[PDB]
PDB file of all heavy atoms in Angstrom:
ATOM      1  N   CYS E   1     -19.490   0.175  96.027  1.00 21.09           N
ATOM      2  CA  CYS E   1     -19.214  -1.055  96.623  1.00 21.09           C
ATOM      3  C   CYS E   1     -17.644  -1.022  97.107  1.00 21.09           C
ATOM      4  O   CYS E   1     -17.453  -1.481  98.195  1.00 21.09           O
ATOM      5  CB  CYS E   1     -19.483  -2.171  95.724  1.00 21.09           C
ATOM      6  SG  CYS E   1     -21.176  -2.571  95.456  1.00 21.09           S
ATOM      7  N   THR E   2     -16.842  -0.746  96.182  1.00 21.51           N
ATOM      8  CA  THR E   2     -15.347  -0.611  96.639  1.00 21.51           C
ATOM      9  C   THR E   2     -14.975   0.640  97.334  1.00 21.51           C
ATOM     10  O   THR E   2     -13.806   0.738  97.772  1.00 21.51           O
ATOM     11  CB  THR E   2     -14.569  -0.711  95.349  1.00 21.51           C
ATOM     12  OG1 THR E   2     -14.799   0.378  94.490  1.00 21.51           O
ATOM     13  CG2 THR E   2     -14.724  -2.167  94.691  1.00 21.51           C
ATOM     14  N   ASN E   3     -15.875   1.594  97.542  1.00 23.61           N
ATOM     15  CA  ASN E   3     -15.888   2.706  98.346  1.00 23.61           C
ATOM     16  C   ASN E   3     -14.595   3.726  97.818  1.00 23.61           C
ATOM     17  O   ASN E   3     -13.814   4.082  98.555  1.00 23.61           O
ATOM     18  CB  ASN E   3     -15.391   2.305  99.857  1.00 23.61           C
ATOM     19  CG  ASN E   3     -15.758   3.437 100.911  1.00 23.61           C
ATOM     20  OD1 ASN E   3     -16.713   4.125 100.713  1.00 23.61           O
ATOM     21  ND2 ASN E   3     -14.775   3.605 101.812  1.00 23.61           N
ATOM     22  N   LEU E   4     -14.621   3.888  96.485  1.00 17.98           N
ATOM     23  CA  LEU E   4     -13.754   4.797  95.879  1.00 17.98           C
ATOM     24  C   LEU E   4     -14.139   6.208  96.299  1.00 17.98           C
ATOM     25  O   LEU E   4     -13.153   7.141  96.551  1.00 17.98           O
ATOM     26  CB  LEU E   4     -13.784   4.695  94.402  1.00 17.98           C
ATOM     27  CG  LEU E   4     -13.378   3.293  93.883  1.00 17.98           C
ATOM     28  CD1 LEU E   4     -13.404   3.311  92.429  1.00 17.98           C
ATOM     29  CD2 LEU E   4     -12.160   2.785  94.377  1.00 17.98           C
ATOM     30  N   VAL E   5     -15.360   6.541  96.652  1.00 15.45           N
ATOM     31  CA  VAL E   5     -15.823   7.825  96.957  1.00 15.45           C
ATOM     32  C   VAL E   5     -15.525   7.996  98.420  1.00 15.45           C
ATOM     33  O   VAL E   5     -16.024   7.241  99.154  1.00 15.45           O
ATOM     34  CB  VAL E   5     -17.308   7.945  96.672  1.00 15.45           C
ATOM     35  CG1 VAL E   5     -17.822   9.523  97.016  1.00 15.45           C
ATOM     36  CG2 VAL E   5     -17.844   7.664  95.178  1.00 15.45           C
ATOM     37  N   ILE E   6     -14.688   8.938  98.660  1.00 17.50           N
ATOM     38  CA  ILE E   6     -14.026   9.241 100.013  1.00 17.50           C
ATOM     39  C   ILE E   6     -14.032  10.654 100.273  1.00 17.50           C
ATOM     40  O   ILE E   6     -13.755  11.605  99.412  1.00 17.50           O
ATOM     41  CB  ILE E   6     -12.630   8.691  99.988  1.00 17.50           C
ATOM     42  CG1 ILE E   6     -12.009   8.579 101.371  1.00 17.50           C
ATOM     43  CG2 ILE E   6     -11.674   9.274  99.014  1.00 17.50           C
ATOM     44  CD1 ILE E   6     -12.761   7.852 102.457  1.00 17.50           C
ATOM     45  N   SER E   7     -14.324  11.061 101.578  1.00 14.70           N
ATOM     46  CA  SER E   7     -14.324  12.422 102.031  1.00 14.70           C
ATOM     47  C   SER E   7     -12.817  12.769 102.162  1.00 14.70           C
ATOM     48  O   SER E   7     -12.067  12.034 102.610  1.00 14.70           O
ATOM     49  CB  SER E   7     -15.059  12.693 103.289  1.00 14.70           C
ATOM     50  OG  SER E   7     -15.090  13.959 103.804  1.00 14.70           O
ATOM     51  N   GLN E   8     -12.570  14.081 101.772  1.00 14.15           N
ATOM     52  CA  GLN E   8     -11.250  14.758 101.938  1.00 14.15           C
ATOM     53  C   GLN E   8     -11.387  16.121 102.485  1.00 14.15           C
ATOM     54  O   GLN E   8     -10.681  17.102 102.157  1.00 14.15           O
ATOM     55  CB  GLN E   8     -10.606  14.775 100.682  1.00 14.15           C
ATOM     56  CG  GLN E   8     -10.366  13.369 100.010  1.00 14.15           C
ATOM     57  CD  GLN E   8      -9.288  13.379  98.983  1.00 14.15           C
ATOM     58  OE1 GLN E   8      -8.833  14.482  98.607  1.00 14.15           O
ATOM     59  NE2 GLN E   8      -8.929  12.132  98.494  1.00 14.15           N
ATOM     60  N   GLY E   9     -12.353  16.255 103.484  1.00 11.31           N
ATOM     61  CA  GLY E   9     -12.639  17.529 104.117  1.00 11.31           C
ATOM     62  C   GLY E   9     -13.740  18.306 103.589  1.00 11.31           C
ATOM     63  O   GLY E   9     -14.952  17.818 103.742  1.00 11.31           O
ATOM     64  N   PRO E  10     -13.559  19.437 102.876  1.00  9.30           N
ATOM     65  CA  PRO E  10     -14.509  20.225 102.280  1.00  9.30           C
ATOM     66  C   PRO E  10     -15.299  19.587 101.045  1.00  9.30           C
ATOM     67  O   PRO E  10     -16.122  20.194 100.611  1.00  9.30           O
ATOM     68  CB  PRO E  10     -13.970  21.597 102.090  1.00  9.30           C
ATOM     69  CG  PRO E  10     -12.540  21.200 101.654  1.00  9.30           C
ATOM     70  CD  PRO E  10     -12.193  20.067 102.440  1.00  9.30           C
ATOM     71  N   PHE E  11     -14.753  18.476 100.562  1.00  9.57           N
ATOM     72  CA  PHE E  11     -15.438  17.944  99.321  1.00  9.57           C
ATOM     73  C   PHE E  11     -15.016  16.330  99.288  1.00  9.57           C
ATOM     74  O   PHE E  11     -14.066  15.940  99.773  1.00  9.57           O
ATOM     75  CB  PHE E  11     -14.965  18.578  98.060  1.00  9.57           C
ATOM     76  CG  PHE E  11     -13.386  18.503  97.855  1.00  9.57           C
ATOM     77  CD1 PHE E  11     -12.761  17.567  97.140  1.00  9.57           C
ATOM     78  CD2 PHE E  11     -12.529  19.573  98.341  1.00  9.57           C
ATOM     79  CE1 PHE E  11     -11.483  17.441  96.974  1.00  9.57           C
ATOM     80  CE2 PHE E  11     -11.187  19.509  98.239  1.00  9.57           C
ATOM     81  CZ  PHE E  11     -10.556  18.352  97.485  1.00  9.57           C
ATOM     82  N   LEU E  12     -16.054  15.622  98.761  1.00  6.47           N
ATOM     83  CA  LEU E  12     -15.796  14.343  98.347  1.00  6.47           C
ATOM     84  C   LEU E  12     -14.881  14.133  97.257  1.00  6.47           C
ATOM     85  O   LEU E  12     -14.919  15.089  96.351  1.00  6.47           O
ATOM     86  CB  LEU E  12     -17.115  13.621  98.185  1.00  6.47           C
ATOM     87  CG  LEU E  12     -18.229  13.627  99.303  1.00  6.47           C
ATOM     88  CD1 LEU E  12     -19.536  13.379  98.754  1.00  6.47           C
ATOM     89  CD2 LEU E  12     -17.853  12.518 100.434  1.00  6.47           C
ATOM     90  N   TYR E  13     -14.082  13.061  97.206  1.00  4.77           N
ATOM     91  CA  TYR E  13     -13.208  12.800  96.100  1.00  4.77           C
ATOM     92  C   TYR E  13     -13.429  11.428  95.572  1.00  4.77           C
ATOM     93  O   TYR E  13     -13.703  10.413  96.343  1.00  4.77           O
ATOM     94  CB  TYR E  13     -11.788  12.963  96.525  1.00  4.77           C
ATOM     95  CG  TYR E  13     -10.859  12.637  95.394  1.00  4.77           C
ATOM     96  CD1 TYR E  13     -10.602  13.449  94.320  1.00  4.77           C
ATOM     97  CD2 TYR E  13      -9.967  11.517  95.426  1.00  4.77           C
ATOM     98  CE1 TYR E  13      -9.628  13.144  93.386  1.00  4.77           C
ATOM     99  CE2 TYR E  13      -9.044  11.200  94.543  1.00  4.77           C
ATOM    100  CZ  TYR E  13      -8.973  11.999  93.343  1.00  4.77           C
ATOM    101  OH  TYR E  13      -8.005  11.573  92.374  1.00  4.77           O
ATOM    102  N   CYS E  14     -13.351  11.218  94.233  1.00  3.90           N
ATOM    103  CA  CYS E  14     -13.563   9.879  93.593  1.00  3.90           C
ATOM    104  C   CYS E  14     -12.551   9.951  92.379  1.00  3.90           C
ATOM    105  O   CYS E  14     -12.288  10.992  91.871  1.00  3.90           O
ATOM    106  CB  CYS E  14     -14.940   9.652  93.115  1.00  3.90           C
ATOM    107  SG  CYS E  14     -14.977   7.911  92.487  1.00  3.90           S
ATOM    108  N   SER E  15     -12.132   8.729  91.959  1.00  4.89           N
ATOM    109  CA  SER E  15     -11.198   8.572  90.686  1.00  4.89           C
ATOM    110  C   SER E  15     -11.536   7.187  90.179  1.00  4.89           C
ATOM    111  O   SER E  15     -11.810   6.234  90.774  1.00  4.89           O
ATOM    112  CB  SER E  15      -9.847   8.771  91.017  1.00  4.89           C
ATOM    113  OG  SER E  15      -9.431   7.713  92.108  1.00  4.89           O
ATOM    114  N   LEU E  16     -11.489   7.244  88.850  1.00  2.12           N
ATOM    115  CA  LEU E  16     -11.530   5.916  87.987  1.00  2.12           C
ATOM    116  C   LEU E  16     -10.148   5.490  87.630  1.00  2.12           C
ATOM    117  O   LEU E  16      -9.483   6.290  87.192  1.00  2.12           O
ATOM    118  CB  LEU E  16     -12.548   6.194  86.840  1.00  2.12           C
ATOM    119  CG  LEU E  16     -13.913   6.713  87.092  1.00  2.12           C
ATOM    120  CD1 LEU E  16     -14.674   6.716  85.763  1.00  2.12           C
ATOM    121  CD2 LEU E  16     -14.616   5.868  88.076  1.00  2.12           C
ATOM    122  N   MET E  17      -9.815   4.225  87.812  1.00  2.00           N
ATOM    123  CA  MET E  17      -8.571   3.705  87.625  1.00  2.00           C
ATOM    124  C   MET E  17      -8.533   3.210  86.105  1.00  2.00           C
ATOM    125  O   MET E  17      -9.572   2.863  85.501  1.00  2.00           O
ATOM    126  CB  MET E  17      -8.188   2.468  88.550  1.00  2.00           C
ATOM    127  CG  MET E  17      -8.040   3.004  90.006  1.00  2.00           C
ATOM    128  SD  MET E  17      -9.483   3.043  90.894  1.00  2.00           S
ATOM    129  CE  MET E  17      -9.728   1.170  91.227  1.00  2.00           C
ATOM    130  N   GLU E  18      -7.380   3.061  85.619  1.00  2.00           N
ATOM    131  CA  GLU E  18      -7.177   2.659  84.116  1.00  2.00           C
ATOM    132  C   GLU E  18      -7.486   1.241  84.134  1.00  2.00           C
ATOM    133  O   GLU E  18      -7.166   0.402  84.919  1.00  2.00           O
ATOM    134  CB  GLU E  18      -5.705   2.948  83.770  1.00  2.00           C
ATOM    135  CG  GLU E  18      -5.413   4.446  83.522  1.00  2.00           C
ATOM    136  CD  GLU E  18      -4.025   4.578  83.070  1.00  2.00           C
ATOM    137  OE1 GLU E  18      -3.213   3.688  82.937  1.00  2.00           O
ATOM    138  OE2 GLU E  18      -3.655   5.735  82.764  1.00  2.00           O
ATOM    139  N   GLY E  19      -8.008   0.775  82.987  1.00  2.00           N
ATOM    140  CA  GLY E  19      -8.427  -0.464  82.788  1.00  2.00           C
ATOM    141  C   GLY E  19      -9.627  -1.197  83.374  1.00  2.00           C
ATOM    142  O   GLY E  19      -9.964  -2.269  83.092  1.00  2.00           O
ATOM    143  N   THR E  20     -10.228  -0.315  84.237  1.00  2.55           N
ATOM    144  CA  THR E  20     -11.532  -0.809  84.795  1.00  2.55           C
ATOM    145  C   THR E  20     -12.594  -0.961  83.781  1.00  2.55           C
ATOM    146  O   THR E  20     -12.433  -0.338  82.651  1.00  2.55           O
ATOM    147  CB  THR E  20     -11.887   0.117  85.997  1.00  2.55           C
ATOM    148  OG1 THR E  20     -12.112   1.454  85.438  1.00  2.55           O
ATOM    149  CG2 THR E  20     -10.854   0.055  87.136  1.00  2.55           C
ATOM    150  N   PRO E  21     -13.740  -1.677  84.144  1.00  4.16           N
ATOM    151  CA  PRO E  21     -14.733  -1.866  83.053  1.00  4.16           C
ATOM    152  C   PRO E  21     -15.382  -0.523  82.723  1.00  4.16           C
ATOM    153  O   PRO E  21     -15.826   0.295  83.597  1.00  4.16           O
ATOM    154  CB  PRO E  21     -15.689  -2.774  83.789  1.00  4.16           C
ATOM    155  CG  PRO E  21     -14.927  -3.686  84.689  1.00  4.16           C
ATOM    156  CD  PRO E  21     -13.904  -2.592  85.229  1.00  4.16           C
ATOM    157  N   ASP E  22     -15.465  -0.249  81.371  1.00  5.87           N
ATOM    158  CA  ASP E  22     -16.194   0.868  80.824  1.00  5.87           C
ATOM    159  C   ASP E  22     -15.723   2.224  81.365  1.00  5.87           C
ATOM    160  O   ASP E  22     -16.499   3.280  81.392  1.00  5.87           O
ATOM    161  CB  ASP E  22     -17.692   0.737  81.048  1.00  5.87           C
ATOM    162  CG  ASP E  22     -18.277  -0.489  80.510  1.00  5.87           C
ATOM    163  OD1 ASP E  22     -17.684  -0.991  79.495  1.00  5.87           O
ATOM    164  OD2 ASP E  22     -19.286  -0.994  80.933  1.00  5.87           O
ATOM    165  N   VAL E  23     -14.388   2.282  81.779  1.00  4.17           N
ATOM    166  CA  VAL E  23     -13.815   3.554  81.964  1.00  4.17           C
ATOM    167  C   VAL E  23     -13.707   4.490  80.678  1.00  4.17           C
ATOM    168  O   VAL E  23     -13.551   5.672  80.738  1.00  4.17           O
ATOM    169  CB  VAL E  23     -12.517   3.547  82.763  1.00  4.17           C
ATOM    170  CG1 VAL E  23     -11.366   2.776  81.891  1.00  4.17           C
ATOM    171  CG2 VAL E  23     -12.047   4.891  83.231  1.00  4.17           C
ATOM    172  N   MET E  24     -13.633   3.658  79.476  1.00  5.72           N
ATOM    173  CA  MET E  24     -13.515   4.457  78.288  1.00  5.72           C
ATOM    174  C   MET E  24     -14.791   5.344  77.992  1.00  5.72           C
ATOM    175  O   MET E  24     -14.617   6.365  77.396  1.00  5.72           O
ATOM    176  CB  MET E  24     -13.272   3.301  77.072  1.00  5.72           C
ATOM    177  CG  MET E  24     -13.015   4.018  75.705  1.00  5.72           C
ATOM    178  SD  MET E  24     -11.411   4.888  75.796  1.00  5.72           S
ATOM    179  CE  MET E  24     -10.178   3.697  76.097  1.00  5.72           C
ATOM    180  N   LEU E  25     -15.901   4.897  78.310  1.00  2.00           N
ATOM    181  CA  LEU E  25     -17.186   5.570  78.092  1.00  2.00           C
ATOM    182  C   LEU E  25     -17.115   6.937  78.895  1.00  2.00           C
ATOM    183  O   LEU E  25     -17.812   7.788  78.398  1.00  2.00           O
ATOM    184  CB  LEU E  25     -18.380   4.844  78.513  1.00  2.00           C
ATOM    185  CG  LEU E  25     -18.896   3.806  77.471  1.00  2.00           C
ATOM    186  CD1 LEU E  25     -17.840   2.638  77.186  1.00  2.00           C
ATOM    187  CD2 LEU E  25     -20.180   3.220  77.997  1.00  2.00           C
ATOM    188  N   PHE E  26     -16.409   7.056  79.962  1.00  2.00           N
ATOM    189  CA  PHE E  26     -16.454   8.234  80.759  1.00  2.00           C
ATOM    190  C   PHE E  26     -15.119   8.993  80.759  1.00  2.00           C
ATOM    191  O   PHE E  26     -14.859   9.864  81.491  1.00  2.00           O
ATOM    192  CB  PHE E  26     -16.812   7.853  82.208  1.00  2.00           C
ATOM    193  CG  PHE E  26     -17.949   7.018  82.369  1.00  2.00           C
ATOM    194  CD1 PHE E  26     -17.897   5.620  82.626  1.00  2.00           C
ATOM    195  CD2 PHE E  26     -19.256   7.575  82.169  1.00  2.00           C
ATOM    196  CE1 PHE E  26     -18.934   4.831  82.818  1.00  2.00           C
ATOM    197  CE2 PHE E  26     -20.404   6.801  82.274  1.00  2.00           C
ATOM    198  CZ  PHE E  26     -20.311   5.439  82.525  1.00  2.00           C
ATOM    199  N   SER E  27     -14.220   8.559  79.834  1.00  2.00           N
ATOM    200  CA  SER E  27     -13.024   9.312  79.580  1.00  2.00           C
ATOM    201  C   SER E  27     -13.365  10.858  79.168  1.00  2.00           C
ATOM    202  O   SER E  27     -12.697  11.775  79.519  1.00  2.00           O
ATOM    203  CB  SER E  27     -12.074   8.553  78.659  1.00  2.00           C
ATOM    204  OG  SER E  27     -12.726   8.453  77.300  1.00  2.00           O
ATOM    205  N   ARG E  28     -14.430  10.753  78.242  1.00  2.00           N
ATOM    206  CA  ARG E  28     -14.752  12.079  77.708  1.00  2.00           C
ATOM    207  C   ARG E  28     -15.362  12.990  78.724  1.00  2.00           C
ATOM    208  O   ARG E  28     -16.060  12.524  79.602  1.00  2.00           O
ATOM    209  CB  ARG E  28     -15.727  11.821  76.530  1.00  2.00           C
ATOM    210  CG  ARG E  28     -15.859  13.034  75.621  1.00  2.00           C
ATOM    211  CD  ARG E  28     -16.575  12.681  74.292  1.00  2.00           C
ATOM    212  NE  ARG E  28     -15.541  12.139  73.357  1.00  2.00           N
ATOM    213  CZ  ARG E  28     -15.763  11.809  72.044  1.00  2.00           C
ATOM    214  NH1 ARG E  28     -16.978  12.296  71.380  1.00  2.00           N
ATOM    215  NH2 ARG E  28     -14.872  11.154  71.240  1.00  2.00           N
ATOM    216  N   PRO E  29     -14.963  14.212  78.714  1.00  2.00           N
ATOM    217  CA  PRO E  29     -15.419  15.145  79.857  1.00  2.00           C
ATOM    218  C   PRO E  29     -16.940  15.214  80.142  1.00  2.00           C
ATOM    219  O   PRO E  29     -17.315  15.231  81.220  1.00  2.00           O
ATOM    220  CB  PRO E  29     -14.747  16.464  79.575  1.00  2.00           C
ATOM    221  CG  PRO E  29     -14.430  16.452  78.058  1.00  2.00           C
ATOM    222  CD  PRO E  29     -14.095  15.060  77.780  1.00  2.00           C
ATOM    223  N   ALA E  30     -17.634  15.381  79.135  1.00  2.00           N
ATOM    224  CA  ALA E  30     -19.241  15.589  79.226  1.00  2.00           C
ATOM    225  C   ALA E  30     -19.753  14.483  79.950  1.00  2.00           C
ATOM    226  O   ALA E  30     -20.582  14.677  80.880  1.00  2.00           O
ATOM    227  CB  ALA E  30     -19.793  16.028  78.031  1.00  2.00           C
ATOM    228  N   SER E  31     -19.610  13.248  79.431  1.00  2.00           N
ATOM    229  CA  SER E  31     -20.104  12.076  80.099  1.00  2.00           C
ATOM    230  C   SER E  31     -19.693  11.836  81.451  1.00  2.00           C
ATOM    231  O   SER E  31     -20.395  11.305  82.459  1.00  2.00           O
ATOM    232  CB  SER E  31     -19.802  10.832  79.215  1.00  2.00           C
ATOM    233  OG  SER E  31     -18.484  10.699  79.122  1.00  2.00           O
ATOM    234  N   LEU E  32     -18.345  12.260  81.799  1.00  2.00           N
ATOM    235  CA  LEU E  32     -17.874  12.233  83.072  1.00  2.00           C
ATOM    236  C   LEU E  32     -18.548  13.167  84.047  1.00  2.00           C
ATOM    237  O   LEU E  32     -18.746  12.837  85.154  1.00  2.00           O
ATOM    238  CB  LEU E  32     -16.334  12.653  83.029  1.00  2.00           C
ATOM    239  CG  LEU E  32     -15.539  12.443  84.381  1.00  2.00           C
ATOM    240  CD1 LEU E  32     -15.587  11.231  84.869  1.00  2.00           C
ATOM    241  CD2 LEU E  32     -14.168  12.931  84.238  1.00  2.00           C
ATOM    242  N   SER E  33     -18.980  14.341  83.598  1.00  2.00           N
ATOM    243  CA  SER E  33     -19.760  15.214  84.390  1.00  2.00           C
ATOM    244  C   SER E  33     -21.035  14.652  84.815  1.00  2.00           C
ATOM    245  O   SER E  33     -21.370  14.675  85.941  1.00  2.00           O
ATOM    246  CB  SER E  33     -19.866  16.635  83.743  1.00  2.00           C
ATOM    247  OG  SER E  33     -20.758  16.517  82.627  1.00  2.00           O
ATOM    248  N   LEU E  34     -21.751  14.132  83.782  1.00  2.00           N
ATOM    249  CA  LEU E  34     -22.999  13.477  84.038  1.00  2.00           C
ATOM    250  C   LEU E  34     -22.989  12.303  84.990  1.00  2.00           C
ATOM    251  O   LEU E  34     -23.791  12.216  85.884  1.00  2.00           O
ATOM    252  CB  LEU E  34     -23.568  13.012  82.732  1.00  2.00           C
ATOM    253  CG  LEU E  34     -25.038  12.421  82.651  1.00  2.00           C
ATOM    254  CD1 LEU E  34     -26.096  13.599  83.077  1.00  2.00           C
ATOM    255  CD2 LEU E  34     -25.419  11.928  81.362  1.00  2.00           C
ATOM    256  N   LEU E  35     -21.990  11.532  84.825  1.00  2.00           N
ATOM    257  CA  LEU E  35     -21.646  10.434  85.753  1.00  2.00           C
ATOM    258  C   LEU E  35     -21.435  10.902  87.137  1.00  2.00           C
ATOM    259  O   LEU E  35     -21.893  10.252  88.045  1.00  2.00           O
ATOM    260  CB  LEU E  35     -20.391   9.609  85.347  1.00  2.00           C
ATOM    261  CG  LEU E  35     -19.938   8.390  86.146  1.00  2.00           C
ATOM    262  CD1 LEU E  35     -20.994   7.365  86.506  1.00  2.00           C
ATOM    263  CD2 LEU E  35     -18.616   7.760  85.652  1.00  2.00           C
ATOM    264  N   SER E  36     -20.696  11.987  87.234  1.00  2.00           N
ATOM    265  CA  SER E  36     -20.350  12.452  88.594  1.00  2.00           C
ATOM    266  C   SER E  36     -21.590  12.988  89.215  1.00  2.00           C
ATOM    267  O   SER E  36     -21.850  12.742  90.496  1.00  2.00           O
ATOM    268  CB  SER E  36     -19.361  13.646  88.480  1.00  2.00           C
ATOM    269  OG  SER E  36     -19.653  14.630  87.523  1.00  2.00           O
ATOM    270  N   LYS E  37     -22.527  13.686  88.567  1.00  2.00           N
ATOM    271  CA  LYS E  37     -23.720  14.047  89.079  1.00  2.00           C
ATOM    272  C   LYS E  37     -24.592  12.868  89.530  1.00  2.00           C
ATOM    273  O   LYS E  37     -25.027  12.796  90.701  1.00  2.00           O
ATOM    274  CB  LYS E  37     -24.410  14.893  88.034  1.00  2.00           C
ATOM    275  CG  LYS E  37     -23.983  16.258  87.869  1.00  2.00           C
ATOM    276  CD  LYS E  37     -24.479  16.851  86.590  1.00  2.00           C
ATOM    277  CE  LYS E  37     -23.717  18.204  86.393  1.00  2.00           C
ATOM    278  NZ  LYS E  37     -24.065  18.837  85.049  1.00  2.00           N
ATOM    279  N   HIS E  38     -24.657  11.766  88.742  1.00  2.00           N
ATOM    280  CA  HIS E  38     -25.564  10.564  89.114  1.00  2.00           C
ATOM    281  C   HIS E  38     -24.847   9.945  90.321  1.00  2.00           C
ATOM    282  O   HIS E  38     -25.615   9.508  91.255  1.00  2.00           O
ATOM    283  CB  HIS E  38     -25.671   9.771  87.919  1.00  2.00           C
ATOM    284  CG  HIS E  38     -26.330  10.150  86.768  1.00  2.00           C
ATOM    285  ND1 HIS E  38     -27.544  11.102  86.922  1.00  2.00           N
ATOM    286  CD2 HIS E  38     -26.335   9.971  85.465  1.00  2.00           C
ATOM    287  CE1 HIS E  38     -28.066  11.405  85.818  1.00  2.00           C
ATOM    288  NE2 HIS E  38     -27.274  10.680  84.875  1.00  2.00           N
ATOM    289  N   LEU E  39     -23.574   9.800  90.318  1.00  2.00           N
ATOM    290  CA  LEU E  39     -22.884   9.179  91.462  1.00  2.00           C
ATOM    291  C   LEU E  39     -23.055   9.885  92.701  1.00  2.00           C
ATOM    292  O   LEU E  39     -23.080   9.213  93.849  1.00  2.00           O
ATOM    293  CB  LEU E  39     -21.422   9.039  91.081  1.00  2.00           C
ATOM    294  CG  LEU E  39     -20.457   8.561  92.118  1.00  2.00           C
ATOM    295  CD1 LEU E  39     -19.393   7.532  91.444  1.00  2.00           C
ATOM    296  CD2 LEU E  39     -19.697   9.715  92.699  1.00  2.00           C
ATOM    297  N   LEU E  40     -22.982  11.227  92.602  1.00  2.00           N
ATOM    298  CA  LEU E  40     -23.113  11.931  93.821  1.00  2.00           C
ATOM    299  C   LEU E  40     -24.587  11.888  94.425  1.00  2.00           C
ATOM    300  O   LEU E  40     -24.754  11.805  95.630  1.00  2.00           O
ATOM    301  CB  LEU E  40     -22.839  13.553  93.696  1.00  2.00           C
ATOM    302  CG  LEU E  40     -23.049  14.565  94.831  1.00  2.00           C
ATOM    303  CD1 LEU E  40     -22.145  14.063  96.078  1.00  2.00           C
ATOM    304  CD2 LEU E  40     -22.603  15.881  94.411  1.00  2.00           C
TER     305      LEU E  40
END
């Protein structure tokens, strides 16, 4: 919705900001990888 996923040429880029809802759950690398797959 906020369009954080943005093209940067040969790859899409996204980032989670500090303090956003439930960023703590995806701080850990494994859950972050799973989230990135679902998000893509």
Side-chain angles (χ1 to χ4, degrees):
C1 287
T2 59
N3 200 42
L4 307 178
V5 186
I6 185 66
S7 177
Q8 303 194 350
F11 59 92
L12 303 159
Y13 177 73
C14 183
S15 63
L16 307 182
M17 295 86 78
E18 292 182 353
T20 56
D22 299 336
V23 67
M24 188 60 61
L25 275 66
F26 311 105
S27 62
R28 200 162 277 195
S31 61
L32 182 60
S33 74
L34 186 63
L35 171 61
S36 52
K37 288 163 184 171
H38 294 328
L39 171 139
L40 179 55

